[PDB]
Design an enzyme around this catalytic site. Structure first.
Site, PDB file in Angstrom:
ATOM      1  N   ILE B  26      -4.733   5.558  -6.544  1.00 52.46           N
ATOM      2  CA  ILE B  26      -3.246   7.020  -6.137  1.00 52.46           C
ATOM      3  C   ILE B  26      -2.213   6.674  -6.766  1.00 52.46           C
ATOM      4  CG2 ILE B  26      -5.390   7.783  -4.898  1.00 52.46           C
ATOM      5  CD1 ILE B  26      -3.957   7.024  -2.635  1.00 52.46           C
ATOM      6  N   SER B  28       1.323   3.139  -7.785  1.00 46.34           N
ATOM      7  CA  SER B  28       1.175   1.556  -8.812  1.00 46.34           C
ATOM      8  C   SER B  28       2.773   0.852  -8.260  1.00 46.34           C
ATOM      9  CB  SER B  28       0.268   1.277  -9.590  1.00 46.34           C
ATOM     10  OG  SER B  28       1.272   1.923 -10.814  1.00 46.34           O
ATOM     11  N   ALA B  30       5.195  -2.337  -9.543  1.00 44.07           N
ATOM     12  CA  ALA B  30       6.252  -2.298  -8.309  1.00 44.07           C
ATOM     13  C   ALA B  30       5.437  -3.218  -6.757  1.00 44.07           C
ATOM     14  CB  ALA B  30       7.217  -1.023  -8.114  1.00 44.07           C
ATOM     15  N   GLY B  32       3.409  -3.054  -4.960  1.00 45.04           N
ATOM     16  CA  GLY B  32       1.975  -2.875  -4.981  1.00 45.04           C
ATOM     17  C   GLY B  32       0.746  -1.953  -5.822  1.00 45.04           C
ATOM     18  N   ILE B  33      -0.336  -1.677  -5.289  1.00 49.80           N
ATOM     19  CA  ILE B  33      -1.256  -1.126  -5.524  1.00 49.80           C
ATOM     20  C   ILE B  33      -2.082  -0.057  -4.670  1.00 49.80           C
ATOM     21  CG2 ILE B  33      -3.305  -0.790  -7.577  1.00 49.80           C
ATOM     22  CD1 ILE B  33      -2.628  -3.013  -8.618  1.00 49.80           C
ATOM     23  N   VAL B  34      -2.269   1.039  -5.131  1.00 49.86           N
ATOM     24  CA  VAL B  34      -3.115   1.970  -3.620  1.00 49.86           C
ATOM     25  C   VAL B  34      -4.606   2.129  -3.880  1.00 49.86           C
ATOM     26  CG1 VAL B  34      -2.825   3.031  -2.141  1.00 49.86           C
ATOM     27  CG2 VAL B  34      -0.426   2.022  -3.021  1.00 49.86           C
ATOM     28  N   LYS B  49      -3.427  -1.090   0.476  1.00 54.32           N
ATOM     29  CA  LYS B  49      -2.343  -0.488  -0.800  1.00 54.32           C
ATOM     30  C   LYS B  49      -2.382  -2.966  -0.323  1.00 54.32           C
ATOM     31  CE  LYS B  49       2.135  -0.343  -0.223  1.00 54.32           C
ATOM     32  NZ  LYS B  49       3.090  -0.327   1.226  1.00 54.32           N
ATOM     33  N   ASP B 145      16.281   7.575   4.879  1.00 58.57           N
ATOM     34  CA  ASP B 145      15.693   7.937   3.390  1.00 58.57           C
ATOM     35  C   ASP B 145      14.677   8.710   3.709  1.00 58.57           C
ATOM     36  OD1 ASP B 145      16.807   7.060   1.004  1.00 58.57           O
ATOM     37  OD2 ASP B 145      14.771   6.953   0.753  1.00 58.57           O
TER      38      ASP B 145
END
Lengths: 10, 340
Positions: B26, B28, B30, B32-34, B49, B145
């Site tokens: 869902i 990615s 950078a 990591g991948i989720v 993640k 942020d």
């Protein structure tokens, strides 16, 4: 009042 | 391995505990991948993640460790939590992959914002936001942020914050003046962001959209008015030279900025507008605090001691921000956190 229990994300 | 099984996710291999099933990507990096996943032990939906190259260099390693400690500083229902952390490797020597598990929410605030909301849902969502923010602050963490894309919700009207500082919205639009002008900030920097979000819930348009910081400042003064001299004195000479020499704006009154027509009690409307007039304040010295926002009549209806006054399990030690280690040293620190 009571707290909302639904939220329509559509 | 025994407790684990592997899933190919594009060019990435997810090796996870067998409790996590139905994986699908869902997000990615950078970073990591989720994958969204079903946790059969908790009977709940989770996000998993996989950190991308946490040990490639000192920068990656430090960042990985920092995320882990930040997550341990927080324990509140209005903030994303670390449900689990694991590695499929069995020793420090081969330790390589780090997996983070957190709650899977239904969506971010972006679209919720564009739709009509009654005062109850509006104030309750904001109350939850302020609860999460206060907890973060007590934990020595100022977000800075906050925006619609890093605040997530479920269909049961619950809300959580993530990213301690799809659809996607650039920060900037929601950043406080002291940030864009480089003045330094305190806790109430996060209140401005809440104000921008509240103001957008009310009219389904970004309050201060600018191509860049410079144009941002303009949208701010056009609507809220040129700040006082005592504020412009706090500015660095180069910034002051620009800001002090713009055309002068009186600012539009809040009844004009957020008229009744945008609202559904005439009381609730006047209260929402009063709160906005106290959050959307350029000079941080005059901006409402988190504690005061929570006590505001528009918000206080939902008050619950357990949700507001719950102390965090830890205070983040800013000394970490300047600390350096070799890759292996960071890695051992991370391995320890993981195995704990």
């Amino acid at each position: 009042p009571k707290r909302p229990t639904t939220l329509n994300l559509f | 391995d025994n407790q684990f099984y592997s899933v190919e996710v594009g060019d990435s291999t997810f090796t996870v505990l067998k409790r996590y099933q139905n994986l699908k990507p869902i997000g990615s990096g950078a970073q990591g991948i989720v994958c969204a996943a079903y946790d059969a032990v908790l009977d709940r939906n989770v996000a998993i993640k996989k950190l991308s190259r946490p040990f490639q260099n000192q920068t990656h390693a430090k960042r990985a460790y920092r995320e882990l400690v930040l997550m341990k500083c927080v324990n509140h229902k209005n903030i994303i939590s670390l449900l689990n952390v694991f590695t499929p490797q069995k020793t420090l020597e081969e330790f390589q992959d780090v997996y983070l598990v957190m709650e899977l929410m239904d969506a971010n605030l972006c679209q919720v914002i564009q739709m009509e909301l009654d005062h109850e849902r509006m104030s309750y969502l904001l109350y939850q936001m302020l609860c999460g923010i206060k907890h973060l602050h007590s934990a020595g963490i100022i977000h800075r942020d906050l925006k619609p894309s890093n605040i997530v919700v479920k269909s049961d009207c619950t809300l959580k914050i993530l990213d301690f500082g799809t659809p996607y919205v650039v920060t900037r639009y929601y950043r406080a003046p002291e940030v864009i002008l480089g003045m330094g900030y305190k806790e109430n920097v996060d209140i401005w962001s809440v104000g921008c979000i509240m103001g957008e819930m009310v009219r389904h348009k970004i309050l201060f959209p600018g191509r860049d910081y410079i144009d941002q400042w303009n949208k701010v003064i056009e609507q809220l008015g040129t700040p006082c001299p005592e504020f412009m004195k706090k500015l660095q000479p180069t910034v002051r030279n620009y800001v002090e020499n713009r055309p002068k704006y009186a600012g539009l009154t809040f009844p004009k900025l957020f008229p009744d027509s945008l609202f559904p009690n005439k009381l609730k409307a006047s209260q929402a507008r009063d709160l906005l007039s106290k959050m959307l304040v350029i000079d941080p010295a005059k901006r409402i605090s988190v504690d005061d926002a929570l006590q505001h009549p528009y918000i206080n209806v939902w008050y619950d001691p357990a949700e507001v006054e719950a102390p965090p399990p830890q205070i983040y030690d800013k000394q970490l921000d300047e600390r350096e280690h070799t890759i292996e040293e960071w890695k051992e620190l991370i391995y320890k956190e993981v195995m704990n």
